[PDB]
Ligand SMILES: CCC1=C(C)C(=O)N/C1=C\c1[nH]c(/C=C2N=C(/C=C3\NC(=O)C([C@@H](O)CC/C=C(\C)CC/C=C(/C)CCC=C(C)C)=C3C)C(CO)=C\2CCC(=O)O)c(CCC(=O)O)c1C
Ligand SMILES: CCC1=C(C)C(=O)N/C1=C\c1[nH]c(/C=C2N=C(/C=C3\NC(=O)C([C@@H](O)CC/C=C(\C)CC/C=C(\C)CCC=C(C)C)=C3C)C(CO)=C\2CCC(=O)O)c(CCC(=O)O)c1C
Ligand SMILES: CC1=C[C@H](O)CC(C)(C)[C@H]1/C=C/C(C)=C/C=C/C(C)=C/C=C/C=C(C)/C=C/C=C(C)/C=C/C1=C(C)C[C@H](O)CC1(C)C
Ligand SMILES: CC1=C[C@H](O)CC(C)(C)[C@H]1/C=C/C(C)=C/C=C/C(C)=C/C=C/C=C(C)/C=C/C=C(C)/C=C/C1=C(C)C[C@H](O)CC1(C)C
Ligand SMILES: CCCCCCCCCCCC(=O)OC[C@H](COP(=O)(O)OCC[N+](C)(C)C)OC(=O)CCCCCCCCCCC
Ligand SMILES: CCCCCCCCCCCC(=O)OC[C@H](COP(=O)(O)OCC[N+](C)(C)C)OC(=O)CCCCCCCCCCC
């Protein structure tokens with residue numbers, strides 16, 4: 001009888017992606033971890049603090065659009 | 068029983084307090100709002116976005132200590 | 135930068151409930167000063183508050199269900215506010231509060247109807263702060279004497295009137 | 304720029320439940336590689352493993368209730384893991400998985416006991432990811448072939464054994 | 472101030488398939504929410520029906536709530552994440568996008 | 579997969595005093611949580627008791643859960659500072675949050 005409808009798209013920002021491609025904390029340390037002998041041979045990224053934090057930061061859907 | 072306890076204290080960081088005493092965004096705008104005629108005669112700080120954001124940022128208990 | 139709120143951290147002044155409903159656009163705060171209306175759509179509308187009431191919010195065609203009015207009486211803490219929730223009138227001034235033309239002990243907290251869990255209005259005062267809420271309309275407000283915040287639920291979208299304007303859609 | 308998890312924002316890879324229980328110290332993840340144990344007490348302890356199974360986690364004087372062991376084999380995906388939950392042994396390798404000895408179709412779902420809602424172990428595989436959880440112990444783990452994450456509940460504080468060490 | 476009584480039953484359970492470590496669930500809550508005044512009894516009764524689906528790993532999520540007061544009030548909330556891959560640490564799970572909708576109907 | 583049948587009754591109400599716009603609450607949940615298997619022939623029944631307090635404006639918060647088939651209990655508390663009229667201004671009490679969590683098994 002009265003309806004409210006909100007569509008919402010969550011995306012990753014450009015800034016987050018730019019940061020993940022650079023060398024600052026924690027993405028630099030992650031890149032260093034990827035050359036260490038315990039990690040380097042695998043298909044998976046290092047199970048390190050640096051790569052994990054980097055993963056969380058990057059996958060946060062900070063860009064919200066309403067329609 | 069096997070009985071385990073965690074105490075937690077949440078506090079405001081020094082960095083947050085230093086930022087609130089400075090003039091960068093949003094604290095500068097808030098200080099400017101405090102001298103406007105619509106706000107200055109009140110005991111309450113301006114009901115502006117500047118002062119409200121600054122309030123939320125400063126009152127976030129970022130310092131966590133476990134005991 | 136309100137949506138840089140992080141609810142993972144405890145906050146000493148704010149609830150998760152308030153800032154989460156606010157940052158997700160469920161509430162639509164409007165601030166009215168003596169000089170300006172700060173709309174929920176992010177516009178500053180200059181309006182010099184006078185001795186006559188101006189409609190700041192209300193349901194289209196139904197101000198008895200919900201309407202909110204602001205005037206100024208001059209002097210220190212000059213703002214007067216009228217909140218109408220389902221035919222029940224709250225008036226706020228710097229000197230306290232009244233419900234349907236009778237003054238009430240707002241510092242001890244007051245509900246009308248006093249017996250009704252679906253209350254039209256609750257109101258409470260500490261120093262110069264007044265808070266008000268209606269379970270019937272879901273309108274919250276608070277008041278300092280210098281300004282009022284009137285917050286409508288987003289469920290009013292397409293029926294909102296008054297100087298606060300549209301609910302963002 | 305921002306360095307903390309914000310659960311106000313949807314995350315494409317992580318749950319609120321996981322990151323909230325983790326950041327509030329309810330879980331205590333331990334990462335073991337072929338070369339290092341990364342303790343939940345924030346320490347890197349070197350261990351270059353044999354093919355001797357080495358105690359990484361377990362209850363102090365109830366290893367049948369909960370214990371976790373790690374082996375190194377050789378070649379690519381060299382890490383082998385043994386997880387004991389309420390006397391039910393899960394063995395993980397690059398090739399798949401077994402419960403007590405008997406190999407199981409881990410690329411579908413597998414639960415033991417299969418009918419019991421208070422299950423000793425559940426285990427699932429997709430590509431080289433293996434996940435495992437026990438409702439009895441509340442120990443979660445996951446495995447890549449190169450490393451394993453063993454996550455203990457904070458309720459094990461004061462009863463923790465193995466190379467993963469203190470819960471603090 | 473007010474008193475509350477809420478009786479409810481939750482039924483439903485885990486959905487077959489997918490990652491059973493994070494197994495999908497479908498749940499129904501049915502109940503009645505009663506508010507009573509202090510001074511005597513004016514009494515407000517609200518029927519509650521809640522339907523939750525959350526697929527394995529919470530990939531696809533649905534929350535539907537129907538209230539009937541004694542008028543009607545409902546909400547459908549949906550949230551869809553991309554299909555995962557083995558490495559959670561590596562970017563590129565599908566389109567890396569969240570699709571959400573909220574619908575409220577007041578009768 | 580497992581099926582669930584959770585019956586519960588919530589009682590409680592508002593606490594007198596303080597800011598009734600944000601009136602304090604107390605709640606008591608009692609109920610029984612039943613998990614069944616696919617057959618429903620393995621059955622796990624857990625008695626559930628939950629006690630919640632949140633005082634006016636959520637200043638003082640308490641969550642207590644007791645689970646029984648043996649036994650598992652938790653008390654969680656969170657105490658914020660006392661407010662002042664201006665939410666925007668720093669200096670509400672000691673600007674500190676005090677939390678405690680206790681878990682007893684057996
Ligand atoms: C513009 C922002 C702003 C500025 C610039 C400023 O100066 N102040 C501002 C906002 C502000 N706002 C504030 C506070 C509060 N705002 C609200 C508002 C609401 N609370 C609500 O619950 C609602 C409802 O409309 C929400 C939607 C509900 C419905 C449509 C119906 C509910 C009923 C039924 C039957 C359906 C139920 C269904 C379910 C599934 C549950 C609003 C508008 C509140 C009150 O909570 C506060 C107080 C503080 C707090 O709560 O923490 C506060 C804190 C004040 C203080 O502490 O002094 C501030 C600072
Ligand atoms: C150091 C951290 C880390 C690094 C460096 C790294 O590389 N990875 C790391 C962690 C990590 N961890 C991950 C995932 C998950 N971790 C868990 C862990 C748990 N979940 C739990 O619920 C628990 C419990 O132990 C919690 C505590 C519970 C109790 C004490 C209650 C006991 C029960 C009672 C009383 C009631 C029983 C019922 C009755 C009726 C009586 C843990 C340890 C999980 C699983 O949830 C995941 C998967 C992801 C997710 O959940 O989203 C994931 C994601 C995996 C992926 O998706 O690929 C990652 C990346
Ligand atoms: C553990 C276990 C175990 C065993 O084995 C088994 C069993 C028992 C089964 C289990 C259990 C379980 C459970 C309990 C679960 C739960 C869940 C939930 C609660 C969900 C929600 C869920 C929920 C959901 C979806 C939600 C969502 C939401 C949304 C979308 C929102 C939206 C929106 C939008 C758009 C926009 C606007 O602006 C606003 C909003 C409003 C913000
Ligand atoms: C509105 C209304 C209206 C009318 O008028 C009336 C009525 C009806 C009454 C009302 C209603 C209400 C309600 C529903 C409520 C709810 C509540 C809740 C849920 C709570 C919680 C609550 C909750 C709580 C406390 C919680 C908390 C928690 C905590 C502390 C935690 C802790 C911790 C610590 C230390 C640390 C470690 O490491 C871990 C942890 C674990 C993390
Ligand atoms: C056990 C959890 C595992 C991991 C995470 C938990 C850690 C603790 C964090 C929670 C704290 C807590 O529950 O504390 C207690 C919380 C409130 O506190 P608050 O919101 O901080 O407001 C404090 C406000 N002051 C600073 C002004 C005093 O009381 C309540 O809920 C009571 C009723 C509200 C229901 C909560 C709904 C919130 C969002 C709803 C979606 C719109
Ligand atoms: C976090 C887990 C639980 C949720 C936490 C809620 C936070 C508590 C405070 C805010 C609550 C709120 O706003 O809505 C709670 C609602 C209505 O709100 P109200 O009475 O207008 O607001 C007054 C308080 N104010 C000023 C702080 C906003 O209560 C009611 O009786 C409404 C009747 C509907 C019955 C609900 C049945 C659904 C049960 C669902 C079971 C799965």
Ligand SMILES: CCCCCCCCCCCC(=O)OC[C@H](COP(=O)(O)OCC[N+](C)(C)C)OC(=O)CCCCCCCCCCC
Pocket residue numbers: 141142154310311313314315316317318319320323525528529530531532550552
């Ligand atoms: C003891 C309980 C307390 C601990 C925390 C548990 C709460 C949620 C668990 C329910 C399980 C479930 O079925 O959730 C269903 C989902 C979980 O989605 P998600 O977490 O983003 O996971 C997605 C994981 N992916 C990315 C791997 C696919 O919810 C939702 O779609 C609704 C989320 C609403 C967001 C609104 C903001 C509030 C944030 C909270 C601030 C503290």
Ligand SMILES: CCCCCCCCCCCC(=O)OC[C@H](COP(=O)(O)OCC[N+](C)(C)C)OC(=O)CCCCCCCCCCC
Pocket residue numbers: 324329436437438441492493494607611624626628641645
């Ligand atoms: C919000 C602050 C309050 C408390 C915060 C919670 C922190 C979480 C700690 C452990 C999480 C957990 O799982 O809790 C206990 C269990 C989960 O056990 P699991 O089957 O091992 O699933 C592990 C997760 N997997 C499957 C994804 C790997 O859940 C339950 O329903 C337990 C059922 C019995 C109790 C039900 C009564 C609850 C009443 C609620 C009234 C408010």
